[PDB]
């Protein structure tokens, strides 16, 4: 499966991809899973996590 | 819904969350969508993208 960018995006970190509207992108298989923005109830810290590292309670 | 961390994770960028195995985490609503590792066919560059910025071809 190929995706098309709907908008321009500028990278904020060393790991995200900059792209322009119209680019064709393919999903890369990755053991970490998709990444989600999460809040730790335990510590109060907040940021992105790799989905394959967690499980529902 | 709450998730539990299955492993320790150390942050690599300014935006990911470090956590220890056993922490309780909640998903933050986010306009960007989940993030996926992608390869640009157009440019050859590779990195994470916000899913809500793309659509299937």
Author numbering:
A (entry chain A), B (entry chain B): 84 to 140
What did the authors write?
Cellular Src kinase (c-Src) is one of the most representative members of the Src-family kinases (SFKs), a group of non­receptor tyrosine kinases that mediate responses to extracellular stimuli, phosphorylating a broad range of downstream substrates. Although v-Src shares 95% sequence identity with c-Src, this kinase shows uncontrollable activity that is responsible for the occurrence of sarcoma in chickens. A number of these mutations are located in the SH3 domain, which plays a critical role in enzyme function by facilitating the interaction with partner proteins and providing the formation of the closed inactive conformation of the kinase. Here, the crystal structures of three SH3-domain mutants of v-Src were determined to unveil the effects of these oncogenic mutations in this regulatory domain.
The crystals of v-Src SH3 W95R-I96T (c-Src SH3 D117N-L124V) belonged to space group P65, with unit-cell parameters similar to those obtained for crystals of the c-Src SH3-domain intertwined dimers. Comparison of this dimer with those previously reported did not show significant differences. Both mutations, Asp117Asn and Leu124Val, do not produce significant changes in the backbone of the protein. As in the previous structures, a low-molecular-weight PEG is positioned in the dimer interface, where a cluster of interactions stabilize the domain-swapped form of the protein. Among the most relevant interactions are an inter-chain salt bridge between Arg95 and Glu115 and a cluster of hydrogen bonds where Thr96 partici­pates in intra-chain and inter-chain interactions. We obtained an intertwined structure of the v-Src SH3 W95R-I96T variant, which shows the same overall fold as previous domain-swapped dimers of c-Src SH3, and the mutated residues do not produce significant changes in the structure. In these conformations, the Leu124 side chain adopts different conformers, facilitating the rearrangement of hydrogen bonds. The replacement of leucine by valine, which has a shorter chain, might impair the ability of this residue to act as a switch between conformations. The v-Src SH3 W95R-I96T mutant is the most stable compared with the proteins bearing the oncogenic mutations in the RT loop. Asn117 forms hydrogen bonds to Ser134 in the 310-helix which are not dependent on the pH, and might confer higher stability on this mutant in the acidic region. Our results show that a v-Src SH3 variant bearing mutations in the n-Src and distal loops, the v-Src SH3 W95R-I96T variant, shows reduced stability compared with the c-Src SH3 domain but is still able to form intertwined dimers.
